[PDB]
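Teaching assistant here, posting this on the class forum so everyone can see the example we discussed in section. The complex has two components, and the goal was to see what a joint structure prediction looks like when all of them are supplied at once.
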Amino acid sequence: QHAKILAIGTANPPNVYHQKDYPDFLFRVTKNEHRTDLREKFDRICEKSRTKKRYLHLTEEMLKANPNIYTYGAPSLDVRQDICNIEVPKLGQEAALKAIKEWGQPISRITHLIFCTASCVDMPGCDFQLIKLLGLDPSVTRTMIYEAGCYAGATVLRMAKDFAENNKGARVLVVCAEITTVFFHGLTDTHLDILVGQALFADGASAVIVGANPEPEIERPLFEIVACRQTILPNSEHGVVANIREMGFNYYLSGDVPKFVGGNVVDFMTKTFEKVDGKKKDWNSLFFSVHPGGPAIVDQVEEKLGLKEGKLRATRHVLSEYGNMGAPTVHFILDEMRNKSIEEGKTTTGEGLEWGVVIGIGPGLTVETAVLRSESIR
Amino acid sequence: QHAKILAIGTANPPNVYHQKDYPDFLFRVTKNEHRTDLREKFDRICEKSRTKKRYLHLTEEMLKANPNIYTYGAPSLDVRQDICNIEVPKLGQEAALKAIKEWGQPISRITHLIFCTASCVDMPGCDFQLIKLLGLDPSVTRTMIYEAGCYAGATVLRMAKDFAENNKGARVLVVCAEITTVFFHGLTDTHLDILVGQALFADGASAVIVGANPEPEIERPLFEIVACRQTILPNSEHGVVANIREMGFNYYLSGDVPKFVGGNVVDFMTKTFEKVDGKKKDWNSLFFSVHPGGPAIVDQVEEKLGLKEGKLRATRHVLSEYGNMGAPTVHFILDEMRNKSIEEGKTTTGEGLEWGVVIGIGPGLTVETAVLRSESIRC
């Protein structure tokens, strides 16, 4: 009786930024139009980003009111936090209400809450704020995951699995929400990593309901969370770093991250599936939700696992339409996969296949995998 | 087959600050000797603190090198983080090695790590840093609890319970570490709450190993984690607030926190024990580890539960000898209880008693309780 995903909901800020327009926007609003060298570099990155549009909370008016946000290294944490500590739970609320609607049970039936964000930090936390917004039972059992990073969309499923399976009748609401206002920085030739985040990072929230022993003909499972594994990729501590500073949340990204992922994916996939089955897996027999940290990560997984054309379609679709929203992204991909599977008349939520995986990738480098089974559409 | 606590280790920074000397120290090193008004207030708080000494990482030399740390509201997060992001995992390491020694198994048997701190935040986190320091398996399953606050010593036991019980053979290392350098602020009559934290807050780390199905040739359980409950006390959102700011981690403490705890303790105890056997009265039958957020919280629990003299001795001992170290404190109290029980020749690690409770109290106000059973002390 494994934990099942019973519902998925998602949300994004209302303002859409088409990638074709973003270089002009960024260089104009940050007063960097004279930096033709940086503009060339940014254009090259955007052209390769495989991201067509992103939703962002941040607006030009907010930048005009708080120019410290685009003045590289200036003190600005306080204004960023004042925004994100409000906007993160609000965006999470929107996703949560959608998940709860799908699930079809009363809010009072939720026994556990996991809230995850890398975009803010406060005491009481986002979990407390969401309890207030939703009217959750004040005795919900909470887990508040702050500043984990891009592997956490898999991690929260692992945590939810344990809580749901060890507590009879438990129903876990999992909310991941990101507002990248805290990570926005201006442009300097001494910190080119910012050009990558400026091209890729985006805002969004997901919500998932998890429970074991779904009520027959009442709850409708989408996926089963079978087994999970977390690991640190050797010799990659510099891959993704983010520091909480007076200037906001600063970050560094190694150009070697894709190669590290590609160099470890056979191993981490093999060791993950060893927890479920003693037989060797055919990687093409699986469905995939891969955290699209950037386009090259997706390509590395495809290449090293020998995946056929189109296997990573759902992943690429979300990267294209939403960008890298951090931890929620893999949940957007599962939702997209389920929806496309309905559209195509597939037999299961996992593209007609039985077994699949969620791959989260973030600081360490850390990879967390969750092995899933699909569920029947009918 | 419930999860058991198999070991507890603790650590503190080396420098001891006796409470009798602390007002003179604080007012001297922060250049506030002219604030005789604030000194009077601080003396009264220290007199009532029931804290005799504390261990602190922060030194006078660090303050001299970084005077923004004592300049109220000045930018100082970066220097605080540069200290705490290093010192928190290091202090945790010290506690963890002690727990691991008691536990008696190789480090390779650790499958899960929970790291908890309210003193810093970074990516990768303290959990990653501790893995490196200890040489844990790179595939340990991690939970990194940042900025929860003072309920979390109970919360991490709840989390460890579920991880240990749902993953057969799992062994969970739980490390809670606090370095209050990030919370140190200077003195202003516009923010008197700082006088309370200056009197009470302290540094320390705990490490606990949790596992179900103890290995009889090696492992020796101390307590069993039976059932847990987390709740928000009504109408108390202003009780404890802490914000992560350019000036460091700022905090506000309502004078009404003890009254909220006292007003709710019978209810939260009753609802917790509803998960076990329906206990509704006669609270003296239990042993207790109560987070000593301040002296008045301890006194309110004692009064409202009708506890007899000496029931909260272990709690009061840790408050006296260590202060309020945040989440680790309740683990120090369990360790003290176990050690006093050995000294006195009690039949169990819980002062001879069978059932007990850990009470964590922090922002929300949030209370997390963990119902424990003790274990036998061999002959």
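For the discussion questions: The first helix of chain B runs from residue 22 to 29. The domain at 222-376 of chain B is CATH 3.40.47.10 (Peroxisomal Thiolase; Chain A, domain 1). Think about how each of these relates to the inputs above.
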